[PDB]
Design a protein around this ligand. Structure first.
Ligand SMILES: CCCCCCCO[C@@H]1O[C@H](CO)[C@@H](O)[C@H](O)[C@H]1O
Ligand SMILES: CCCCCCCCCCCC
Ligand SMILES: CCCCCCCCCCCC
Ligand SMILES: CCCCCCCCCCCC
Ligand SMILES: CCCCCCCCCC
Ligand SMILES: CCCCCCCC
Ligand SMILES: CCCCCCCC
Ligand SMILES: [K+]
Ligand SMILES: [K+]
Lengths: 270, 259
């Protein structure tokens, strides 16, 4: 009973391991079909600019022009706009831009990293202590928003109450109005807002938000009335996708137990 | 009823103001040094080669800026490099998305790739969360059976054996598995396994057994970052009573001053 269920558990996780392995193989085979065509077009035509610019200017050193670009590529990862025109520059660590990157570290959202030892060592501890600190703010807003929605759904679930009202199915009308109100607020409105400031397309504003509020991975700059109100949204939108990504785990745990019985029957009866 | 979250809000706002003022003191100095000396290599290149002119170095950067969205190119890419999105490199980036490590130096450019990735993340992040949590309690008994040995003040000697004997494993080996510097191996691991994300893969210019360690190391920092929340919850309630006293004693103090 103590380690008997643990022989049951090692199975259940080793199986999930293979689901993710397949899921990565699937994603790999999909991304290599979607992106590797677009990459060859870019490289095989960037050779033509390489091949042009050596013939546009033969007197520059050939092998060293590669090294010159490599030293630019390596020196892009800093705060970098290197030119004799636009040599005057702003700091990527100014009054508010370092405030930004402090905000990414504790959120674990994420080209410009610190280069100082003291910066790297402070950041290690700033993260190891700021990530848990932020976790309480996120969870605090998570249940703060949980009652903003809990009181809003206490009204909605009463306004269809006729005779013959089932309590197991109105729970699903509520889960519809949460993806509905949610993605209208947190996915629809900001994505439309970034079209009229940065000029983003229709997709890339939603692609941005999903990658952002899932903390996987910018429109803050415009070259201070506009960042502080957005950082609010980010915190609440992070609490939003925190619930959303957790909901999907509820579905995936249902789908697991439903495919669990399906294989059990269809291999027992056959 | 009592909110208590608006209070924590100010702690993080304060804590961001702290970090901001610290990082601007640590990094804005080294930012000047590099950039004002990068001008010196640029100011030499115009002089080392009048062949390439002022207007043309703008064009040369513009073609790099355009080729940042793609990557690194022909000769530095045929003598040193392979093509991205290949058999196993797209396996990598699929692995970053579900872990939310999100290295993202090469993001997808196709709309279909971006839409697939949105759903691949929205469905892969929860899927991976059970593998992580499954390994978390899998490792929880790997460590639970190791402490049944040790338990046969001592509560804190054990917590030393978990930070030491864990972090000795997870910063020495994994960074080397995937010389070096002493700090950046640990800086790499902390950024990686906290899922802030994977500090700069290097190609040496000038899979299955590894993703084991990353999965276990993620489960490791998942517990580590969670333990600190336990102590930060303790430190909060320890500082809660301290202000309660030191405002209560000063309150009666003032009642004595009246007489
Ligand atoms: C299993 C433990 C192995 C311990 C040996 C540690 C030394 O690693 C070596 O680091 C060198 C990079 O500077 C590479 O040149 C070698 O290929 C690599 O082997
Ligand atoms: C992209 C999602 C792939 C999901 C693969 C599911 C495989 C289920 C196998 C169940 C075996 C018991
Ligand atoms: C009421 C919460 C305030 C205490 C939490 C901040 C102190 C922990 C930060 C790290 C200090 C070493
Ligand atoms: C970085 C450490 C910050 C500590 C600031 C403490 C804020 C006061 C807490 C008051 C609790 C009632
Ligand atoms: C090598 C310089 C180390 C600087 C560490 C700064 C730590 C700041 C703690 C408040
Ligand atoms: C939605 C496909 C994921 C697989 C879930 C079921 C796993 C047993
Ligand atoms: C472009 C719209 C994508 C919607 C994704 C929904 C995934 C459940
Ligand atoms: K993350
Ligand atoms: K990240």
């Amino acid at each position: 009973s103590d380690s008997a269920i643990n022989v049951m558990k090692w199975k259940t996780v080793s199986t999930i391991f293979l689901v993710v392995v397949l899921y990565l193989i699937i994603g790999a085979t999909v991304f290599k079909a979607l992106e590797q065509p677009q990459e060859i077009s870019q490289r095989t035509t960037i050779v033509i600019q390489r091949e042009k610019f050596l013939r546009a200017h033969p007197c520059v050193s050939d092998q060293e022009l590669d090294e010159l670009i490599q030293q630019i590529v390596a020196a892009i990862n800093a705060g970098i706009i290197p030119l004799g025109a636009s040599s005057n520059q702003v700091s990527h660590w100014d009054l508010g831009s370092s405030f930004f990157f402090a905000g990414t570290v504790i959120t674990t959202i994420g080209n410009i990293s610190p280069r100082t030892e003291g910066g790297k060592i402070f950041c290690i501890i700033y993260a190891l202590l700021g990530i848990p600190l932020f976790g309480f703010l996120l969870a605090g807003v998570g249940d703060q928003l949980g009652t903003i929605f809990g009181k809003g759904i206490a009204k909605v679930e009463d306004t269809f109450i006729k005779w013959n009202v089932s309590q197991t199915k109105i729970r699903i009308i509520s889960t519809i109005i949460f993806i509905l109100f949610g993605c209208v607020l947190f996915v629809a409105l900001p994505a439309v807002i970034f079209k009229h400031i940065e000029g983003w397309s229709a997709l890339d504003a939603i692609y941005f938000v999903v990658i952002t509020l899932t903390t996987i991975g910018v429109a803050g700059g415009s070259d201070d009335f506009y960042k502080p109100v957005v950082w609010f949204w980010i915190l609440v939108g992070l609490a939003y996708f925190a619930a959303v990504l957790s909901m999907i785990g509820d579905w995936l745990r249902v789908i697991a137990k439903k495919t669990k019985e399906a294989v059990g029957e269809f291999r027992a009866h056959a």
